[PDB]
Structures are given as C-alpha cells and as structure tokens.
C-alpha cells in the first residue's frame, strides 16, 4: 500500500541522474588545474671575487 | 720590410689593410656553454 510508495520512492533513482545532470550543466566554472612539483635541487651561483 | 723608408722592419699589424682581396678571416671552434634555463619545463602540464 504505502509500503509500494516508499518502494517506488526507492525504484525512481534513474531521474538522481536528471537532477543532478541539471545542477551539474547550470553550476559553476570547471577546473582542470593541474600542478605535481617533487624535490628540489639546491642548486645556485659559485662567482669568485 | 719596408723599403725606401726610414722607418723599416714594422712589425705587427698595421691599421691600413688587411682586406688584400681575402674572402675572409676563418676562425672554426665550439662552444660549451652551461646555463640557468627556466624554459625548459616540460612538467607543469595540465591534465587531458
């Protein structure tokens, strides 16, 4: 009775998709930043006077 | 030499000419050279 309602409130989750398509298409900016730098080298500059 | 001067047996190079219808004074060799480069970064590159 009820019971098939909260079971076809459960069955609906291939309209999540829709909604979430919706924010997704209308939402902000997306970013492909994208930056990984490891060691070091401590390298530098050996001048004589 | 020089000749009919008094000023004789000038050595070195002079400043009037050293054209003489040479082509050209040809000196060959290499470089070695080691330098800071910040150009050559083939790291920070985005995704896709």
């Given amino acids: 009775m009820a019971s098939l309602i909260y079971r076809q409130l459960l069955t609906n989750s291939y309209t ?6 919706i924010q997704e298409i209308g939402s902000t900016k997306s970013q492909n930043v994208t930056i990984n730098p490891g060691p070091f080298a401590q390298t530098g500059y050996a001048p004589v006077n | 030499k020089l000749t009919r001067t008094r000023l004789d047996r000038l050595y070195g190079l002079p400043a ?30 985005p995704i896709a």
């Fill in chain 2, 16 to 45: 009037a000419d050293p054209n003489n219808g040479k082509e050209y004074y040809e000196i060959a060799g290499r470089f070695s050279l080691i330098s800071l480069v910040p150009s050559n970064d083939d790291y920070q590159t």
């Fill in chain 1, 16 to 21: 999540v998709d829709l909604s979430d398509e």
